[PDB]
Write an enzyme that holds these catalytic residues in place. Structure first.
Site, PDB file in Angstrom:
ATOM      1  N   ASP A   1      -1.785   5.592  -5.078  1.00 17.99           N
ATOM      2  CA  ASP A   1      -2.240   4.728  -4.005  1.00 17.99           C
ATOM      3  C   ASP A   1      -2.747   3.242  -4.164  1.00 17.99           C
ATOM      4  O   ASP A   1      -4.002   3.259  -4.719  1.00 17.99           O
ATOM      5  CB  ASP A   1      -3.261   5.419  -3.234  1.00 17.99           C
ATOM      6  CG  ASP A   1      -3.915   4.493  -2.010  1.00 17.99           C
ATOM      7  OD1 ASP A   1      -3.145   3.675  -1.462  1.00 17.99           O
ATOM      8  OD2 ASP A   1      -5.030   4.816  -1.616  1.00 17.99           O
TER       9      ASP A   1
ATOM     10  N   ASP B   1       0.610  -1.254  -0.263  1.00 19.36           N
ATOM     11  CA  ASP B   1       0.141   0.100  -0.060  1.00 19.36           C
ATOM     12  C   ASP B   1       0.934   1.379   0.108  1.00 19.36           C
ATOM     13  O   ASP B   1       1.310   1.603   1.145  1.00 19.36           O
ATOM     14  CB  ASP B   1      -0.825   0.082   1.155  1.00 19.36           C
ATOM     15  CG  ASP B   1      -1.723   1.274   1.268  1.00 19.36           C
ATOM     16  OD1 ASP B   1      -2.176   1.888   0.163  1.00 19.36           O
ATOM     17  OD2 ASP B   1      -2.378   1.447   2.359  1.00 19.36           O
TER      18      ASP B   1
END
Ligand code: BDJ
Length: 390
Positions: free
Chosen positions: A232, A36
């Site tokens: 992201d 992430d």
């Protein structure tokens, strides 16, 4: 490709996330960890959970160190609470190095762990400024660079299959590559174009122009970055600020007008299906996002196809129809270039030069008439005004 040991070390999919295998503790405890770039905490399940068939057991690690500090991380739909500590961590299919890093042992969670995702933790690769409880908790990548000779840089190639993967296929399928400390040239085609990291916290960038099938969205470029634009991998969809989303959906509907889709589809809540192999990719427009370049007044563009923004999903009838969900959603927190956008490109997070590189992915899904693209340079003026300031 000079990093063969890290190529193909990822598994997963845009909807449930892409993960890499890691080990924590002594003797090493193997766990699958979500990659992430939208967070900065290394956190792993450390207590029994209906969706975890394994978790970090601190009492079995001789190198475990208790930090005697708790950590609470509340999201919009998720929430996880843990206990801070440190331990020796390694990435089997990564740099051959072991580092002592901060680990949040998750003991309580709500809507965090996803059933069938096969991952038991999260690796936050962003900067310490957004690390919880505060920037004093050093992020894993910062610990890795400070304790070894690994170059301060990582690159991600997320590979969407272009079709639904069942629980067994997604476990045997290569989901991509996370190259730690370098760039593998076999993961992309064409040239790499870099956009400046505007500020080190989230991996923030500046979008200076948006086109739908070459047609300028014509919005004040400041709207594209309100209140920020980030890369992201922890987010599935391409998320756009409310006003940008409304203008983009209106332009995408107009370009695809030969076919009418229910409001539920554009809201990204309901799937649309076509007889096997007949998905009309050609009626859907390509989307181009122009990003600030490294040279004054110079910009470049990344172009994605509907094969990237239409996310493959298994028909509620498991039939033979090819079905998808619209993977573009509105945001109240700025532009988010999620996994469905990253699936079209090889993305280089060059932390050492404070820049992010984009190149067409060797694994992006396309058809015989159109391909994703990264092109430049374009003369662009006043791009510094496209950035939002609170
Ligand atoms: C900033 C934003 C929205 N992007 C993220 N990757 N995360 C972390 C995250 C939250 C909830 C679920 C996951 Cl998988 C990741 C965030 O909170």
């Amino acid at each position: 490709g000079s990093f063969v040991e890290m190529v193909d070390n990822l598994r997963g999919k845009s909807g449930q996330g892409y993960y890499v295998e890691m080990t924590v503790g002594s003797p090493p405890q193997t766990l699958n960890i979500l990659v992430d770039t939208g967070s900065s905490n290394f956190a792993v399940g450390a207590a029994p959970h209906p969706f975890l068939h394994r978790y970090y057991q601190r009492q079995l690690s001789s190198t475990y160190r208790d930090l005697r500090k708790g950590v609470y991380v509340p999201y919009t739909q998720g929430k996880w609470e843990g206990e801070l500590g440190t331990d020796l961590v390694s990435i089997p299919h990564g740099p051959n190095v072991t580092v002592r890093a901060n680990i949040a042992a998750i003991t309580e969670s709500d809507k965090f762990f996803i059933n069938g995702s096969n991952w038991e933790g999260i690796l936050g690769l962003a900067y310490a400024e957004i690390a919880r409880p505060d920037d004093s908790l050093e992020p894993f990548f910062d610990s890795l660079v400070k304790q070894t000779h690994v170059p301060n840089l990582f690159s991600l190639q997320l590979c969407g299959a272009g079709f639904p993967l069942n629980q067994s296929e997604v476990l045997a399928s290569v989901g991509g590559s996370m190259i730690i400390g370098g760039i593998d040239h076999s993961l992309y085609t064409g040239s790499l174009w870099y956009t400046p990291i505007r500020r080190e916290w989230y991996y923030e960038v500046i979008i200076v122009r948006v086109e739908i099938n070459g047609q300028d969205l014509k919005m004040d470029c400041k709207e594209y970055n309100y209140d920020k634009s980030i890369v992201d991998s922890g987010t599935t969809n391409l998320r756009l600020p409310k006003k940008v989303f409304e203008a983009a959906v209106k332009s995408i509907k107009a370009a695809s007008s030969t076919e009418k889709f229910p409001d539920g589809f554009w809201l990204g809540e309901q799937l649309v299906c076509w007889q096997a192999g007949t998905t009309p990719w050609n009626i859907f427009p390509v989307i181009s996002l122009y990003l600030m370049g490294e040279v004054t007044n110079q910009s470049f563009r990344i172009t994605i196809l509907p094969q990237q923004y239409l996310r493959p999903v298994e028909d509620v009838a498991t039939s033979q129809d090819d079905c998808y969900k619209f993977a573009i959603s509105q945001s109240s927190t700025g532009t988010v270039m999620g996994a469905v956008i990253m699936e079209g490109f090889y993305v280089v997070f060059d932390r050492a030069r404070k820049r992010i590189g984009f190149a067409v992915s060797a694994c992006h899904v396309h058809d015989e008439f159109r391909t994703a693209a990264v092109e430049g340079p374009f003369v662009t003026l006043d791009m510094e005004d496209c950035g939002y300031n609170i």
